[PDB]
């Protein structure tokens, strides 16, 4: 239609800027990264945003609300993703044997 | 901290079906997920392989967790060579 073609345009053309993530990663490493790191790390974070919004619209469709996304559907989105191990936290030393 | 992903993330939520005009407190949430996702995939990437940040260990975490992040990183590494072959 005429909205699906505009939505497909924003699904492809949108990206995080490489001039800021290279500034963001290098504040964590200390020295330097490469261009093929920033190209991949800018691409995984678009999949991760698409992992949340496609699942936060499943929270909103499950409850009785409309397309505008309140934060109620966004804290619930991170809760359901973390219970399936999708959201990694490297500060919680987990233990499976008890 | 200011918001470094305020205008970029509004295009992306529209790209996955949200609205043309998302709420400010919803982009407040998604901007903090991405900064933690890049932090909790760099803090764990500087212990694997070596104490640097080569991209041969960024591709390790994407398998056995979610195959969409792995099938969309093999496309960005293949298309880097088909966009330098055209020049």
């Amino acid at each position: 239609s005429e909205e699906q073609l505009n939505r497909y345009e924003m699904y492809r053309r949108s990206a995080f800027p490489k001039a800021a993530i290279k500034r963001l990663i290098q504040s964590i490493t200390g020295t330097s990264v490469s261009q093929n790191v920033v190209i991949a790390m800018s691409g995984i974070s678009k999949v991760f945003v698409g992992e949340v919004v496609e699942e936060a619209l499943d929270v909103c469709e499950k409850w009785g609300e409309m397309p505008p996304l309140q934060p109620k559907h966004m804290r619930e989105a991170v809760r359901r993703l973390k219970s399936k191990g999708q959201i990694p936290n490297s500060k919680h030393k987990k233990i499976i044997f008890f | 901290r200011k918001r470094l992903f305020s205008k970029e993330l509004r295009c992306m939520m529209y790209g996955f079906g949200d609205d043309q005009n998302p709420y400010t407190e919803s982009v407040d949430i998604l901007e903090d997920l991405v900064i933690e996702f890049i932090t909790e995939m760099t803090h764990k990437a500087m212990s694997i392989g070596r104490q640097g940040r080569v991209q041969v260990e960024d591709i390790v975490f994407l398998i056995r967790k979610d195959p969409r992040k792995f099938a969309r990183v093999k496309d960005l590494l293949t298309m880097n060579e088909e966009l330098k072959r055209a020049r």
């Binding site: 505009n6 924003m10 053309r13 949108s14 505008p68 309140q70 934060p71 | 205008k7 970029e8 509004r10 295009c11 529209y14 043309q20 005009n21 998302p22 709420y23 400010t24 407190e25 919803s26």
Partner: peptide, 26 residues
Amino acid sequence: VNLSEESARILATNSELVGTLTRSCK
């Protein structure tokens, strides 16, 4: 020179269509 000016035109239309009014929520 063609790659330098056309890169910012994919993002310039990404500030005219999406996000016209800024909302909030209780």
